[PDB]
Amino acid sequence: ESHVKYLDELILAIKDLNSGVDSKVQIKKVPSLKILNTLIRNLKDQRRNNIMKNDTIFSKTVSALALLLEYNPFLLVMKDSNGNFEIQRLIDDFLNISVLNYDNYHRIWFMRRKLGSWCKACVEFYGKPAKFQLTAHFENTMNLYEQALTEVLLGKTELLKFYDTLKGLYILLYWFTSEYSTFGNSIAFLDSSLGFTKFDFNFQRLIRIVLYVFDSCELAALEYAEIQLKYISLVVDYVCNRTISTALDAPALVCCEQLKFVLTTMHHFLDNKYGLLDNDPTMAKGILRLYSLCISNDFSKCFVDHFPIDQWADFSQSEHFPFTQLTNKALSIVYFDLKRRSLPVEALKYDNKFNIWVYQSEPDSSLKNVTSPFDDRYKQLEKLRLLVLKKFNKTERGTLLKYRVNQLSPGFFQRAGNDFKLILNEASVSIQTCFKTNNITRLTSWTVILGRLACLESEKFSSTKDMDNWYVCHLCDIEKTGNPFVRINPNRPEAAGKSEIFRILHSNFLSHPNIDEFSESLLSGILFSLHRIFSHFQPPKLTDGNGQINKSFKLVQKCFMNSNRYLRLLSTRIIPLFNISDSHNSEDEHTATLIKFLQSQKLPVVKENLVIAWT
Amino acid sequence: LKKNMVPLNPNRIIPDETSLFLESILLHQIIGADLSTIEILNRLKLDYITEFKFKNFVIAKGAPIGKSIVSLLLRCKKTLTLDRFIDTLLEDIAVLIKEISVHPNESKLAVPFLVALMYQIVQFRPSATHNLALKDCFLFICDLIRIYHHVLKVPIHESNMNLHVEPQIFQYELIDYLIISYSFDLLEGILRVLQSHPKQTYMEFFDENILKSFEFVYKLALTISYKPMVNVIFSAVEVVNIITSIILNMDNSSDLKSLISGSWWRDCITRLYALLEKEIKSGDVYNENVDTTTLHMSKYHDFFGLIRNIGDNELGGLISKLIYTDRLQSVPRVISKEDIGMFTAPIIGYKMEKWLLKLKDEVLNIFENLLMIYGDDATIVNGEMLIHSSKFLSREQALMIERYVGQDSPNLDLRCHLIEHTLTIIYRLWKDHFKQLREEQIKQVESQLIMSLWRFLVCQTETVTANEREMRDHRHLVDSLHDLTIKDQASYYEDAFEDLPEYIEEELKMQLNKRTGRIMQVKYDEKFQEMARTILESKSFDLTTLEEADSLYISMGL
Amino acid sequence: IIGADLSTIEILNRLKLDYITEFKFKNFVIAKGAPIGKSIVSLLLRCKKTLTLDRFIDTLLEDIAVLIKEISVHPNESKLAVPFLVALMYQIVQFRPSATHNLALKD
Ligand SMILES: [Zn+2]
């Protein structure tokens, strides 16, 4: 509270040494380095006990340092000549704040994403002399932590040193178990793409070393169990973000061996009764997340073989599984879902109360904790549990345009829905009436829906298709090789005559008397939607003779010469769509119209897309 | 006195690692198959080799083969410790694969499952596999691939009178596709477990024969005149990645470098150039189309493989339906070839594009590595990394701006990561390797270099974003898929994304904004603007004169 | 067993039970034409990971007992699996006599 204005003046002081103009990076050592006195001032104002616990004056404190190091990549590699560059001094100092913030998952994710920016997007300026002085620094500071982890076997070690050694190894393994976008090729063991690096076998070595330490020691401290849950948190984070993460389905895995490793590792963690702690969600999150990746896909056998669950059952007790109420609850839900998909269809009935399919319960209850309803405010847990219990329903599967109409007109498919004539009239009454001026965002969502529904109109007389199994367009979304304008049909149906969605599009948007001020984003949206219409339908005649540019080609005039380059290069994408028709372009007059339009831009900023628009 | 120390466990159960390895062999199962691998080998006999025997590893004539594997496993669990149990299994299963392979009459159905079993043996404990076993296994898998010489040598186009009146059978083709793909996957696995050994002992692996054998099999995989099998292209370039990555990360790097000729690299890099200039298009990945221009992942080899899950595994049911499962046989169960193929989803095409874009990221990543190996000039860091990489950068900016913006595919970001990566492959080639950028070669790509730098410096205008209100309206138009991704990550899979304290989503409404800027092709990152600025404007070479440069600056503003 | 060519598990790999169309007691599924010893070795591998020795023993005892039982009380089915399952059960009992809990012995 006292120094929020101090940091708010310090960010202005950093931005005040920009340049004479708005373009400033300064990758070279300038011949005036006074802000390194601020750099020393930044991290030294971070390791302290009083007001770092406040969220804002820590987040702005590290955001100021990231804005300093972003617009000054020379500060990293400035060679504080002990033997090395100062980014080695930055890493081990940056480790201390993260090990002091071991428990808060916000304060270490947010530190490691910007530590990712400081080496990926900032030591691409230097390469060979400065890639191998931090990818060797991480190997040495990781060799040190795995080396000092093994002199606790001989028992002469300390206890707080054991604690911070475990936590520092946790943070070093936490940095490298992010997705590939955090640390790019900045570090030479995270180098390979295709989801399989030098760090993978090294990580599977170090987690087996720390499990060997957990077997070799014996301790029942409570917060030692607290820091012992973070290794299974780290090992579920290791596998849950190497996933390809498709549209709305389960994020599919890349390497079955890493899943086998993580399941075997946390099953070994449960066998030895490691990490039991009251009202802690960590192991429950791991079990539910990893079962969510293995619901009905190719990895369900890999889940049931390597994380065996049917040997902790013990139905006869209210303490239903052995471990802890959250962990027993999550494992009971996983057991319930495995037992449900084991049994046949006739052996299970629909609840009509919790909307989950369920088998004949028990001689006891044994069905409370699976649907109790769900737990204390641990917000991801109950939605994991909803997904595990509700993925069996085999209902209308999630689809992209069905999402974006259910995100827009909420609760729309409680009706016929898949019939096509009614969604046009729902979009029509929402596109004619329910806006006064407020929807400068909702109209852009409506025009991306009008873009996608325009394709779905074109799939009849392409009489078999449907609203639900339309994922993406076969013409506007997937693309093939060769000339991309061979794919669009010359004798496709005309837009005004048959496509009622172009009637909608011209009725609201292109005949609105304030086209030259919608917004730039609504112009881009109406250009995307008009691209989809004119790629699926023949555009109208550009001129009858009475002047008369036909309110869509007029929008091409408006955006093709506009100030921003985005509307220019987006409106150049429909200039070819006007050139492809028949009974409008059979004797080549739309071509001549587009030619004498493109012969009339003697303005310097339009030179890019014009060269595109010719070609 | 000092009651602080952590107390040991008096009854430490150090787990028997050879028992765990025995169990991982016994319940090894490849993805999509009904039986386990040992349980498939219990259903296989070899009825032309009347008596196999190498070193007390007798197989009878009609006996199950997996009977003899599990007999070897039980017999050598008692005796050998783990580092000897591994190479005993490696050489015995290698000799069995060998004399099943070099035989005129015998079916080779045991060979894919023995290679997959061998891969499970190698990668179990990478510290336990001694690297002379890795050397012998590498040489065996390379000449195993040169035995199966003809799988990677089918011609591009057939006769006009190649009548397709033939029984149209797939089972033998499925077997030797599995043999080649599991063999290349095993080569990748050998080199990544060799990558995990301590960095003083790489010379126990490498000699002349390693690099000659991989040179042969690498010319075989990344083909020119034959139909490409994409499965082996992934692994064959990941091997070259592991090679460059350990040349970077060993101390006595000279012995690898003195062991490698110049002809090895200048035959490798031209095939990488020919791979980098191929097209990745969703609508005709799985099509069969014009050769050597579209990375296409043929229908007739669509299964996972031993490391990475590469297709949708459409041929995984046929691995299980390759045997009768209630019978002990040698010939395969008949798989009809034209029954597969039956239309539901082009999402499969999107994720196969995702793999192929990661493949091109891999190729220009090993370009980035061997810039750093050969920092001094050589035959190979020779200026054609301006030509091929600037052709690549210019075309993947061009058809990004013309085709992909607003096409709601997941693969846009990675496709505009490639350009954002290959600029740096330009940039450190520009700043740190100008001594070999020959003047005649720069003018071969003076169009494309200058235009590709211009499409980064056009973003310094930035009259598009400038706020927050219309940028999220733009990301409804271009980047709704990543909103679905980040909501599924936030509600299920990320520990930091619950109880968001109004500093962790104000980073999200910075980085989704810079993401959708970098996708929308206006407002890239400022650092890449600087890297593109300090190539064109810098006076290391006169790309433009001072009256030709401001003709480019007037086409932004300026 | 002394005098036999194959091992006992390797004899049970050569045995199927074609009148009991689906055997199952507690995740110990045997199919109709499947090898029986396939299911024994699947049970063994599955219960090595999970159970410690005194529970691994009586799990094997009651599962192989239920299999011997419903092969035995059947009118049409041959009983060839039963001697080797009883010999296998004897090998299970006498391996570590301190580990076999005596309620398993009673049953
Ligand atoms: Zn469309």
B-C CB pairs within 8 A amount to 16
**Neighbouring C-beta atoms of residue B182, cutoff 10 Å:** 28
Amino acid identity of residue A394, one-letter, is K
User: Which backbone phi and psi does B159 adopt, to 5 degrees?
Assistant: -65, 155
What SS3 class is residue A494?
strand
- Please name the residue of chain A whose CA is at the shortest distance from the CA of residue B501: A55
Lookup: tokens for A277:
């702690």
| Rounded to 5°, angle at Cα A118 from A116 and A122 | 115
Q: How was this structure determined?
A: cryo-EM
Nearest to A609 by CA among A554, A571, A577: A571
Asked whether the CA dihedral A108, A112, A118, A123 is positive or negative, the reply is positive
SS3 B336: strand
Cα(first)–Cα(last) distance of chain C, in Å?
24
3-class DSSP assignment, residue A538? strand
C-alpha B88/C-alpha B95 separation (Å) is 11
Looking at beta carbons, which residues of chain C come within 8 Å of B326?
A: 16, 33-34
DSSP B226: B
Nearest to A393, CA basis, from A424, A350, A353, A360: A350
Query: C-alpha distances in angstroms, B24 versus A92, A203, B92, B516, C7?
Result: 39, 20, 18, 45, 22
Using CA atoms, how far apart are residues A545 and A420, in angstroms rounded to an integer?
37
- Do B386 and B437 contact (CB within 8 A), yes or no? yes
| Preceding amide of C83 cis, omega within 30 | no
Question: What secondary structure does DSSP assign to A161-227, as a single string?
Answer: HHHHHHHHHHHHHHHHTS-TTTS-SSSTTS---TT--HHHHHHHHHHHHHHHHHHHB----HHHHHH
B521: Cβ contacts below 8 Å, ≥ 6 apart: A566, A569, B397, B400, B401, B405, B416, B455
Resolution, given in Å to one decimal, reads 2.8
Q: For residue B408, what are its two tokens?
A: 């709601």
Upper half-sphere CA count for residue B88 (Cβ side, 13 Å): 18
Asked if residue B224 lies in contact with residue B173, where contact means CB atoms within 8 angstroms, the answer is: no
Cα–Cα dist B512/B468, whole Å = 11
Q: Using the 8-state DSSP alphabet, how is residue A349 labeled?
A: E
Cα separation of B29 and B320, whole Å?
11
Closest CA to A179 of B482, B79, B510, C3: B482
Distance A459 CA to ligand 1 centre (A): 9
According to DSSP, the residues that pair with A468 across neighbouring strands are: none
Alpha-carbon gap: C29 to the closest alpha carbon of chain A (Å) = 12
The CB density around residue B19, as the number of other CB atoms within 10 Å, is: 12
CA B52/CA B46 separation, integer angstroms: 9
Do A298 and B234 lie within an 8 Å CB cutoff? no
Taking the C-alpha atoms of residue A164 and residue A592, their distance in angstroms, rounded to an integer, is: 76
**What is the distance between the alpha carbons of residues B276 and B274, in angstroms, rounded to a whole number?**
6
Cβ–Cβ under 8 Å, residues A475 and A536? yes
Which residues in chain A (225-244) have CB-CB distances under 8 A to chain B? 233, 237, 240-241, 244
Q: Quick check: B471 and B465 in contact, CB under 8 A?
A: yes
Which chain A residue has the Cα nearest residue B245? A188
Chain B touched by A59 (CB under 8 Å) = yes
Q: Which residue has the tokens 């693969």?
A: B411
At which residue do the structure tokens 């400033």 appear? A24
Give dist(CA A247, CA A398) in Å, integer.
Answer: 9
Instruction: Decide if B278 contacts B287 (C-beta within 8 A).
Output: no
| All residues at 6 or more sequence positions from C7 whose CB lies less than 8 Å from its CB, including other chains | none
Burial class of residue A464, CB neighbours in 10 A (0-12, 13-18, 19+)? exposed
Contact C49 B23 (CB under 8 A): yes
CB B256 within 8 A of CB B271: no
Q: Does the distance separating the beta carbons of C51 and A308 come in below 8 Å?
A: no
In A30-85, where does DSSP find H-type helix?
36-43, 56-70
Please check whether residue A195 touches B, CB under 8 A.
yes
| Chain B residues touching residue A25 (CB < 8 angstroms) | 526-527, 529-530
With contact defined as 3+ CB pairs under 8 Å, the chains touching A are B, C
Residues, beta carbon < 5 Å, ion ligand 1: A 455, 473, 476, 532
For A484-501, letters b (16+ CB in 10 Å) and e give beeebbeebebbbeebbb
Give the CB-side neighbour count of residue B270, counting CA atoms within 13 A: 9
Interface test with C, best of B27, B69, B327 (most C CBs within 10 A): B27
**Residue A190, min C-alpha distance to chain C (Å):** 33
Q: Of the candidates B188, B477, B146, which has an alpha carbon nearest to the alpha carbon of residue A524?
A: B477
**Distance between Cα A454 and ligand 1 center (Å):** 6
Sign of the Cα torsion A233, A236, A242, A244 reads negative
Please report where in the chains the tokens 């894919």 appear, as a residue.
Answer: B112
Could you give the CA distance from residue B481 to residue A472 in angstroms, rounded to a whole number? 12
Interchain proximity B42–C13, CB inside 8 Å? yes
C50 and chain B: CB distance < 8 Å anywhere?
Answer: no
Residues 6+ apart with CB under 8 A from A114: A62, A66
C-alpha span between A204 and A216 (Å, rounded): 18
**Closest chain B residue by Cα to residue A484:** B403
Within 8 A by CB and 6+ apart from A186, the residues are: A116, A119, A120, A123, A124, A131, A134, A135
Burial of A514 per CB tally in 10 Å (0-12, 13-18, 19+): exposed
- Tally Cβ neighbours within 10 Å of residue A2: 7
Pairwise CA distance, residues A71 & B462, whole Å:
17
Report whether B281 contacts A480 (CB < 8 A): yes
CA–CA separation, A25 and B457 (whole Å): 13
Query: What Å distances lie between residue A603 and A569, A610, B402, B555, CA to CA?
Result: 15, 10, 21, 9
Residue A351, min C-alpha distance to chain B (Å): 25
Please give, one letter per residue, the 3-state secondary structure of chain C: CCCCCCCHHHHHCCCCCCCCCCECCCCCCECCCCCHHHHHHHHHHHHHHHCCHHHHHHHHHHHHHHHHHHHHCCCCCCCCHHHHHHHHHHHHHCCCCCCCCHHHHHC
Q: Helix/strand/coil (H, E, C) string of B251-301? A: CCHHHHHHHCCHHHHHHHHHHHHHHHCCECCHHHCCCCCCCCCECCCCCCC
**How far from each other are the two terminal CA atoms of chain B, in whole angstroms?**
77
DSSP 8-state code for residue B332: P
B133 CA to middle of ligand 1, Å? 56
Residue A16, judged by CB atoms within 10 A of its CB (0-12, 13-18, 19+), counts as exposed
Closest Cβ opposite residue A109 in set B234, B238, B496: B496
**What are the angstrom distances between the C-alpha of A367 and each of A289, A335, A349, A358, B391?**
21, 11, 14, 9, 63
Determine contact: B39 vs chain C, CB below 8 A: yes
Interface touch A193/B281, C-beta < 8 Å: no
Return the number of other C-beta atoms located less than 10 Å from residue A567's C-beta: 23
How far, in Å, is the centroid of ligand 1 from the Cα of A537? Answer: 10
Report yes or no: A573 at the B interface, CB cutoff 8 Å: yes
Strand partners, A209: none
The DSSP bridge partners found for residue B294 are: B279
Query: Taking the mean position of all CA atoms in its chain, how far away is CA B525?
Result: 28
CA distance A333 to chain C (A): 19
- C-alpha closest to that of B74 among C10, A9, A146: C10
Q: Using CA atoms, how far apart are residues B380 and B366, in angstroms rounded to an integer?
A: 13
Task: Report how far residue B275's alpha carbon sits from residue B224's, in angstroms, rounded to the nearest whole number.
Answer: 10
- Compare CB distances from C48 to B23, B42, B67 and report the shortest one's residue: B23
The Cα–Cα gap between B333 and C32 comes to 20
**Contact check, Cβ <8 Å, A292/B492:** yes
Give whole-number Cα distances, A331 to A252, A306, B41, B426, in Å.
22, 15, 35, 52
**C-beta separation of A86 from A78 below 8 A:** yes
Instruction: Write the DSSP string, A76-107.
Output: TT---TTTS-THHHHHHHHHHHHHHT-S-SHH
Q: Which residues of A touch B549 (CB under 8 A)?
A: none
For A220, residues 6+ apart whose C-beta sits below 8 A from its C-beta are: none
List Cα–Cα distances, B542 to B527, B549, B553, in angstroms.
22, 10, 16
Among A452, A469, A441, A446, CA closest to A401? A452
Q: B305 is written with which tokens?
A: 């493989």
The reply to whether A223 touches chain B by the CB within 8 Å rule is: no
Partners of B150 in the β-ladder: none
CA dist C95 to A609, B291, C106, Å? 83, 64, 17
SS3 label, residue A450: helix
Helix (H) or strand (E) holding A350: strand A348-350
A10: part of which helix (H) or strand (E)?
helix A4-16
Cβ-defined contact of B354 to A244 (cutoff 8 Å) = yes
Q: By C-alpha distance, which of A415, A409, A456 is closest to A431?
A: A409
User: CA-CA distance, A335 to B525, in Å (whole number)?
Assistant: 48
Q: Tell me, what amino acid is at A592?
A: A
- Report the separation in Å between the CA atom of B479 and the middle of ligand 1, taken as the mean of its atom positions: 17
For chain B, the farthest-separated pair of C-alpha atoms sits apart, in whole angstroms, at 93
Structure tokens of A75?
A: 């500060």
Q: How far are the Cα atoms of A126, A255, B19, B61 from residue B28, in angstroms, in the given order?
A: 45, 15, 14, 25
Pick from A121, A1, A112: nearest CA to B507: A112
State how far the Cα of B315 lies from the Cα of B523, in Å rounded to an integer: 44
The two three-digit tokens of residue C84, written as one number: 């080797």
CB crowding A266-302: b at 16 or more within 10 Å, else e: bbbbbeeebbbbeebbbbbbbbbbbbbbbbeebbeeb
Per CB-CB distance under 8 Å, the chain C contacts of A267 are: 49
> In the complex, which subunits touch C with 3 or more CB pairs below 8 angstroms?
A, B
Distance B412 CA to ligand 1 centre (A): 17
Q: What is the largest CA-CA distance in chain C?
A: 40
- Whole-number Cα distances in Å, A27 to A72, A127, B270, B530: 7, 13, 33, 8
- Find out whether B336 and B170 touch, Cβ atoms under 8 Å: yes
In three-state secondary structure terms, A358 is strand
Burial label for C71, CB within 10 Å (0-12, 13-18, 19+), is buried
CA Rg value for chain C: 14
For chain C, say whether A272 makes contact (Cβ under 8 Å): no
Q: Which long-range contacts (CB under 8 A, 24 or more apart) does C101-107 make?
A: C101/C54, C101/C57, C101/C58, C103/C58, C104/C57, C104/C58, C104/C61, C104/C62, C107/C58, C107/C61, C107/C62, C107/C65
* Contact state of A27 with B530 under an 8 Å Cβ cutoff: yes
Instruction: List chains adjacent to chain B, taking adjacency as at least 3 C-beta pairs closer than 8 Å.
Output: A, C
Q: C45: distance to nearest CA of chain B, Å?
A: 7
DSSP letter (8 states) at residue A493: P
Q: How far separated are the first and last CA of chain A, in Å rounded?
A: 59
Any idea what DSSP says for residue B401? I
Distance B345 CA to ligand 1 centre (A): 15
Q: Please give the distance of CA A526 from its chain centroid, rounded to a whole number.
A: 26
Report whether B373 contacts B257 (CB < 8 A): yes
Q: Measured between beta carbons, which residues in chain B are less than 8 angstroms from residue C35?
A: 42
C-alpha A283/C-alpha A276 separation (Å) is 9
Q: What is the 8-class DSSP label of residue B400?
A: I
Amino acid, res. B28: H
Rounded CA-CA distance B157/B139 in Å is: 32
DSSP state of A539: P
Rounded to a whole number, what is the distance in Å from the CA of B36 to chain C's nearest CA? 10
Q: How many CB atoms lie within 10 A of CB B327?
A: 10
- Ligand 1 centroid–CA A509 distance in Å is 19
Q: How many CB atoms lie within 10 A of CB A223?
A: 10
How is residue A398 annotated by DSSP? -
Give CA–CA dist A267/A334, Å, rounded.
Answer: 14
Residue A289 makes CB contacts below 8 A (sequence gap 6+) with A236, A240, A384, B492, B493
Residue B42 near chain C (CB below 8 Å): yes
Distance from CA of A213 to the nearest CA of C (A): 20
